């Protein structure tokens, strides 16, 4: 099976460079071209360029003298380098490829790597339990409040992903330069606290992986 996977810095300072790597399994980069595509927040896709099997590169001219795509066939890696970032370069960056005779369609896409361009500083989240204050009811709603982080994103899972039904994670909100969100889960009031419920919070920019157990007052 095919997988493309981006890796990148998370935060880039204005006027500095971005370097991202796409690692390929399931096909040979010697034989197939790999493209870079980005998506600014709340906007559509924007194609950046492609490096073809034989090494020819084509680029989007809106990026004229700013971009370099290259690869190392021996590592099954494709690279993007983009100079002179500004705030409008803040985006999700994807690598993409085509595994068949699908015309211009790209059927393979990476998960994407988020890039924020800013003069500010990476800051890990704090995570606080949301526990019912001091209940009747056939269900109980439990949560994690995630505050003070920068840049985006964070992700929140419940019992490492095993608890999925009934999970509700609100959008992040930016205030005073920092992000917060909350994630909540509804479970039968019998199931907790008798069975452990934890939230898992990841903040790739600070290489943070927190676990918070929710326990009863």
């Amino acid at each position: 099976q095919v997988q493309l996977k981006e890796s990148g810095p998370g935060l880039v300072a204005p006027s500095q460079s971005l370097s991202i790597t796409c690692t390929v399994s399931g096909f040979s980069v010697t034989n197939y071209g790999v493209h870079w595509v980005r998506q600014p927040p709340g906007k559509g896709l924007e194609w950046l360029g492609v490096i073809w099997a034989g090494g020819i590169t084509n680029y989007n001219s809106a990026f004229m003298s700013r971009l370099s795509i290259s690869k190392d066939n021996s590592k099954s890696q494709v690279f993007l380098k983009m100079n002179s970032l500004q705030i409008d370069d803040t985006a999700m960056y994807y690598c993409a490829s085509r595994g068949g005779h699908y015309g211009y369609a790209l059927d393979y896409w990476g998960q994407g790597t988020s890039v924020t361009v800013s003069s500010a500083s990476t800051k890990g989240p704090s995570v606080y339990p949301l526990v019912p204050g001091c209940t009747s009811g056939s269900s109980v709603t439990l949560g994690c409040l995630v505050k003070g982080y920068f840049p985006e994103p964070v992700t929140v899972k419940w019992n490492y992903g095993a608890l999925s039904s009934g999970v509700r994670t609100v959008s992040s909100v930016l205030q005073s330069g920092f992000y917060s969100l909350s994630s909540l889960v509804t479970v039968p009031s019998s199931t907790w606290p008798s069975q452990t419920v934890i939230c898992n919070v990841a903040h790739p920019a600070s290489k943070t992986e927190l676990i918070k157990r929710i326990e009863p007052r």
Binding site: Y104, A105, D107, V131, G143, K147, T169, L184
Partner: protein, 211 residues
């Protein structure tokens, strides 16, 4: 540089309804048009290639047609989980502007929960009180906070979920953030939710001294 003009920008449709999106190419391009689906927080997914060919795994309710300049993508019978942005592409750099497919469903009143600050946050000098409004439709909703029975507007941040993949409802949190000192100066905390489903609000409350 080919322009793909995609309409409409937004759809609001009920489960079971038909949807049609159009992309008009600025030049004649045979059948060299692709359709992708992008769900919230996911990468694009290929649905339709060469104007009319369903990928692998793509369900039969998704179809495409067209040749030359006027291209159509249809979902026969919209399912809840089809909530997404859809867009066309011609050559690699020519994308349509996208169509956000949103689901309408029967109005639903929220279930409200209130959460006092945690001991952990208090130790940090902070106190967030959270009012959570779960599984309501439509999205618009109001929350009023009272502290010791007096309305409080400062310190409140509101945020919603995306529409739910399975039930098509929204949820939201309203978070009132105070300093620990301010929190400890008052005892009663109340939130009141009002939604179009009723002129009556839904209230939740607690007292700090009990908590």
């Amino acid at each position: 540089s080919i322009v793909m003009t995609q309409t409409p920008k937004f759809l609001l449709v009920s489960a079971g309804d038909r949807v049609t999106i159009t992309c008009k190419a600025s030049q004649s391009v045979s059948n060299d048009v692709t359709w992708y689906q992008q769900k919230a927080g996911q990468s694009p997914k290929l649905l339709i290639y060469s104007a009319s060919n369903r990928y692998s795994g793509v369900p039969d309710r998704f179809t495409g047609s067209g040749y030359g300049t006027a291209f159509t993508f249809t979902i026969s019978t919209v399912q809840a989980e089809d909530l997404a942005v859809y867009f066309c592409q011609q050559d690699y750099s020519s994308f349509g502007g996208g169509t956000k497919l949103e689901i309408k469903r029967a109005d639903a009143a929220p279930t409200v929960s209130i959460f006092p600050p945690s001991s952990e946050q208090l130790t940090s000098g902070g106190a967030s009180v959270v009012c959570f409004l779960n599984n309501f439709y439509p999205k618009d909703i109001n929350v009023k906070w009272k502290i010791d029975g007096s309305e409080r507007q400062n310190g409140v941040l509101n945020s919603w979920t995306d529409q739910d993949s399975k039930d098509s409802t929204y949820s939201m949190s309203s978070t009132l953030t105070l300093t620990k000192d301010e929190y400890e100066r008052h005892n009663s905390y109340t939130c009141e939710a009002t939604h179009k489903t009723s002129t009556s609000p839904i209230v939740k409350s607690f007292n700090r001294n009990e908590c």
